[PDB]
Amino acid sequence: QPLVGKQILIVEDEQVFRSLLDSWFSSLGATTVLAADGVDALELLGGFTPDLMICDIAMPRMNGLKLLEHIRNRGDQTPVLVISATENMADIAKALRLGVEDVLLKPVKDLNRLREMVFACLYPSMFNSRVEEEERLFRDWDAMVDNPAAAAKLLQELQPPVQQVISHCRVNYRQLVAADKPGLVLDIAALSENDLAFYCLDVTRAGHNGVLAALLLRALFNGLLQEQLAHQNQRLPELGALLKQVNHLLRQANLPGQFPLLVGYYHRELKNLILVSAGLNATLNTGEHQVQISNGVPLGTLGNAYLNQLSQRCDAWQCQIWGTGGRLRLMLSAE
Ligand code: BEF
Numbered sequence: 001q002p003l004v005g006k007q008i009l010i011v012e013d014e015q016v017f018r019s020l021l022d023s024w025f026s027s028l029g030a031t032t033v034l035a036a037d038g039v040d041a042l043e044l045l046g047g048f049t050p051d052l053m054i055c056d057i058a059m060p061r062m063n064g065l066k067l068l069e070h071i072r073n074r075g076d077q078t079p080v081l082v083i084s085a086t087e088n089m090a091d092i093a094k095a096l097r098l099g100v101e102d103v104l105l106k107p108v109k110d111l112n113r114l115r116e117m118v119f120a121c122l123y124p125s126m127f128n129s130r131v132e133e134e135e136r137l138f139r140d141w142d143a144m145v146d147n148p149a150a151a152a153k154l155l156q157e158l159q160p161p162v163q164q165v166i167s168h169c170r171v172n173y174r175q176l177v178a179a180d181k182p183g184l185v186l187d188i189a190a191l192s193e194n195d196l197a198f199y200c201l202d203v204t205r206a207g208h209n210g211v212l213a214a215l216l217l218r219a220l221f222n223g224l225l226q227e228q229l230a231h232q233n234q235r236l237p238e239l240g241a242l243l244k245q246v247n248h249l250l251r252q253a254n255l256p257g258q259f260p261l262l263v264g265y266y267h268r269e270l271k272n273l274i275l276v277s278a279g280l281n282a283t284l285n286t287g288e289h290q291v292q293i294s295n296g297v298p299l300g301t302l303g304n305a306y307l308n309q310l311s312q313r314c315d316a317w318q319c320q321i322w323g324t325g326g327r328l329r330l331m332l333s334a335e
Pocket residue numbers: 056057058059083084085086106
């Protein structure tokens with residue numbers, strides 16, 4: 001019973017998931033207090049001091065964002081984990097502005113991730129993991145926007161190694177032209193045992209808002225992709241729709257600019273690469289063919305009409321990617 005002595009307020013209006021969280025936390029030893037909505041949560045906070053809050057957004061009489069606004073105006077600094085089915089990017093941006101430890105988008109696929117995140121909240125000295133650092137990026141968002149040097153340093157520290165194994169696939173890159181240190185930013189991330197996604201961003205076009213956008217995208221890219229596949233009940237994503245959601249996130253986060261981006265996803269069981277570009281030039285070479293990708297127009301404007309997705313079958317590929325910020329070659333092999 002690791003969580004004995006620790007108090008958790010669960011603010012959730014839907015019965016199945018609230019009972020699920022209540023049972024799971026109680027089995028681990030936590031004292032759980034249940035709130036139907038934001039008003040009920042405030043009344044319960046009149047007589048409970050939680051060590052952690054789990055908070056849904058969409059709720060009848062007060063949504064979780066107004067509850068968060070009230071507790072943070074009162075100077076309460078209790079950690080909050082947001083767990084919400086919301087597809088509204090304004091909600092995620094407002095949650096980040098108000099100060100939260102993390103934002104999980106329902107459905108929660110594996111309980112181990114939520115377990116480690118709760119444990120990072122309730123015992124931060126103990127669970128100083130990668131999850132700790134993700135939550136650190138989530139809660140320090142205001143501190144990041146108010147200090148450009150820290151944001152640039154963090155973005156450079158998050159640039160992945162040039163040689164990796166992700167989802168049983170071999171992934172390399174090389175910067176070829178980088179006159180800017182945070183120039184062409186890259187993220188590559190596993191989604192399951194057998195598929196991965198990646199993004200390459202050009203922060204130099206937009207200046208400082210590029211850097212912040214990169215940080216925000218690193219916090220949330222997987223979460224937005226996973227959610228799409230869960231909510232639309234699909235294995236293979238619709239990356240254009242994802243990038244439209246990314247547009248709405250960067251706009252609602254008050255990060256105006258032009259953000260040249262390429263996003264992709266690979267499934268090794270299906271041997272299936274999917275690519276789409278908003279603003280960056282790219283040439284793919286799959287072993288059998290060379291495919292030149294239409295660069296489209298950058299994110300940061302609404303109405304992007306050129307988010308047309310390209311699918312290719314391959315066991316391995318190399319993509320040259322470039323824009324005004326510089327040049328790199330990203331390389332994958334499924335064997
Ligand atoms: F009702 Be919650 F925001 F999923």
